[PDB]
Amino acid sequence: MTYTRYQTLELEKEFHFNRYLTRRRRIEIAHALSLTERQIKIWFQNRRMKWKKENKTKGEPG
Numbered sequence: 669m670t671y672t673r674y675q676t677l678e679l680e681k682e683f684h685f686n687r688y689l690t691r692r693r694r695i696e697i698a699h700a701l702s703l704t705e706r707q708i709k710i711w712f713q714n715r716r717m718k719w720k721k722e723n724k725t726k727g728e729p730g
Contacts (some may be wrong), residue, residue: 671701671703671707671711672701673703675701675702675703677695678700678701679701679708679711679712679715680699680715682697682712685713687716688712689708689709694708694712
């Protein structure tokens with residue numbers, strides 16, 4: 669069970685665009701994806717924890 673490739677794409681695009689999803693924009697992306705908000709928030713948080721372990725070479729000192 670997985671979010672779609674598109675949804676994941678749009679999420680990473682949103683993560684690139686912005687780091688912290690406020691009420692309205694989270695709804696907007698959640699509509700654009702079609703997920704239940706909670707999921708987007710979770711994805712956004714977890715995305716941080718699997719941002720900084722992928723963003724290596726540059727991101728060694730943190």
